[PDB]
Amino acid sequence: MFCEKAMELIRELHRAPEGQLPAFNEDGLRQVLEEMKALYEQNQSDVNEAKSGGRSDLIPTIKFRHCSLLRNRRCTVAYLYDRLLRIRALRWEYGSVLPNALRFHMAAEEMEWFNNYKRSLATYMRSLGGDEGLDITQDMKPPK
Amino acid sequence: GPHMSEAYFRVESGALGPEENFLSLDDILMSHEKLPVRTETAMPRLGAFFDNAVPQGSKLELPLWLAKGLFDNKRRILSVELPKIYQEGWRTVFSADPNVVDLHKMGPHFYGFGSQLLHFDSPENADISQSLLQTFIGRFRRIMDSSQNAYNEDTSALVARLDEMERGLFQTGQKGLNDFQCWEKG
Amino acid sequence: LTPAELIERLEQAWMNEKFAPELLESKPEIVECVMEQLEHMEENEDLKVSIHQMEMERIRYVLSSYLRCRLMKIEKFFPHVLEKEKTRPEGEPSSLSPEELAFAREFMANTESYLKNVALKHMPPNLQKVDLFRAVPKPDLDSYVFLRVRERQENILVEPDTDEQRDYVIDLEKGSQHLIRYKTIAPLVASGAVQLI
Amino acid sequence: MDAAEVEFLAEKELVTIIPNFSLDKIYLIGGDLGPFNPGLPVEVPLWLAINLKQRQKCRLLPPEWMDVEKLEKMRDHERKEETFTPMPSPYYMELTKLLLNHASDNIPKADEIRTLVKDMWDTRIAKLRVSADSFVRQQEAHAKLDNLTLMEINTSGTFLTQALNHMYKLRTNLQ
Secondary structure (H helix, E strand, O other): OOOHHHHHHHHHHHHOOOOOOOOOOHHHHHHHHHHHHHHHHHHHHHHHHOOOOOOHHHHHHHHHHHHHHHHHHHHHHHHHHHHHHHHHHHHHHHOOOOOHHHHHOOOHHHHHHHHHHHHHHHHHHHHOOOOOOOOOOOOOOOOO | OHHHHOOOOOOOOOOOOOOOOOOOHHHHHHOOOEEEEEEOOOEOOOHHHOOOOEOOOOEEEEEHHHHHHHOOOOOOOEEEOOOHHHOHHHHHHHHHOHHHOOOOOOOOOHHHHHHHHHHHOOOOHHHHHHHHHHHHHHHHHHHHHHHOOOOOOOOHHHHOOOOHHHHHHHHHHHHHHHHHHHHHOO | OOHHHHHHHHHHHHHHHHHOOOOOOOOHHHHHHHHHHHHHOOOOOHHHHHHHHHHHHHHHHHHHHHHHHHHHHHHHOHHHHHHHHHOOOOOOOOOOOHHHHHHHHHHHHHHHHHHHHHOHHHOOHHHOOOOHHHHOOOOOOOOEEEEEEOOOEEEEEEOOOOOHHHOEEEEEOOOOEEEEEHHHHHHHHHHOOEEEO | OOHHHHHHHHOOOEEEEEEOOOEOOEEEOOEEEOOEOOOOOEEEEHHHHHHHHHOOOEEEOOOOOOOHHHHHHHHHHHHHOOOOOOOOOOOHHHHHHHHHHHHHHHOOOHHHHHHHHHHHHHHHHHHHHHHHHHHHHOOOOEEEOOOOOHHHHHHHHHHHHHHHHHHHHHOOOOO
16 A cells, blocks of 8 residues: 555666666655655544543554655655665765766756765865875775 | 776675664665564554454465554564565475575565564564574575685576675675786786 | 884774774774874885885875764764763763764754754644654664784673673683674773774 | 686785896895806795796796695695694695696696695695584584685685574574
């Protein structure tokens, strides 16, 4: 029943090998957020019937919707978080400028997260030594 | 990028322990798998998924996460049933030769799901736990031999029978051996 | 501290950081001094130049690897790395340099903001807050590690399982090599008594 | 940790070379080297020896232990022991690999050395699997492995620690 759409988000990501970033699933995200809205509304009225009608027999259904709300949220955050972990890898694998084909699969907010990460990293590396610190995104392999 | 595997820190699984990892994609896929349950009370306005309520004592197959949520030591809302794969019959069969079982077909998260199954305080918890451990110990060698190509055997048939966690372990053994061999070449 | 000893301690930290399941202590004295050594050698017959440059590259790689390793840990466990530093008793060795601390705080702000704007603020009233300290896994101190003993130490605790009556002790002899849960020998990594490998 | 990184450490081991050039004592971070004189033996880090070699500026001398007869006995000794025996070098796999790959023309009976070293490795990793299997079956929580080298430990290392980590969780998921 509930949370099936959320699982689509998770599966899509888990099937993408080597940190590949599939297209941001805007529709999936929207539909899950909409399911949570509905679930919250139905529980609000039921918790009311159980407050003004002696319907303690609705509690089971109430917890049911509540567990589904926490599940939808868990999948949402896990999905979005994992994507950030792959986007972070993009900085180290492709550099400061991302290929447009890679940027195409990112959400506007993700590009923002990327730029902030890019800046924090640049700042950190610049603080290591005297002149321009040290670019630790270089020298990934020991001397030949 | 092939070497992008190092810069990508996926959240690992925690299902083998007390609780699963909140952000673990694998645990989320694991806790989606169905579990046999019997309602101990009616659930109004939900029969549509199985006051348009759901009769009590109904036999249902619910995903592990929902079953966990509605469960409590008492049979208040649900009474949980152990999947056949974790009952005495199958664990005795596993006991004869852990390597003969296809943990992908009976899994794919055999260890993870079985570990989280312990949250329903079943009388057989101690037996379930011991069984998961002995099963792993009994297939460990086969996994190390194959992943490290000790006998030059094709690993395809073995990988197909490994559960998700075993596949990960296999991959690690293969990676370490492969890395050494390539270093050995060029 | 000799320049040679400096490079030796650098490589020790590099290896310990590679295998320890948690972020180890910050080593400012090492990073800074090694950075200087690298800059002083940047102030540059040819055969002698090539050889010097070759050694520089060897040192550069180790420093870069070490630093990358620490950033990886900082990113993976950002909420826990920040909580530990916030509650660190004044006087106790820190596990974050000033810059790493700033970087970690930024990684945290950036991630929370992203999660809030893209999804959290769009969820029901009482579901918009997610405690990242609880959502993000903590370093697993029970992880197994291999080690080499450089300084003798007796009575290391070994706890096979949950039953304490199964606990026992062992002695770590100089030059010996062991396989054991990290948790028990953690303070020995910090002091240099043992080396993770 | 990768094999390349283990080799990185191996490259710090001292080897003896015969330079064909003249050079003043060089002051490197981590030790002074030389002076260098034509036809005269001098100890240098393996990484320098390999580089100079490629520059056709020296000839590498085989470590004393890198000898057929000696290797045969070590291999034989290894078989008779239940545990791991002391190796000729903490980086015997690396010194053999690098020396045969860049100075085999300087190593006597290089092919025989390559075969013996490989068998030494094959003998030890088989022993390692056996030992790991019994370690696991007895559900031990600690082991001592005094003579295993870094390359040997690291190649099976991540596999062994991950396996034990999974087991520790399976052995503690109830209490």
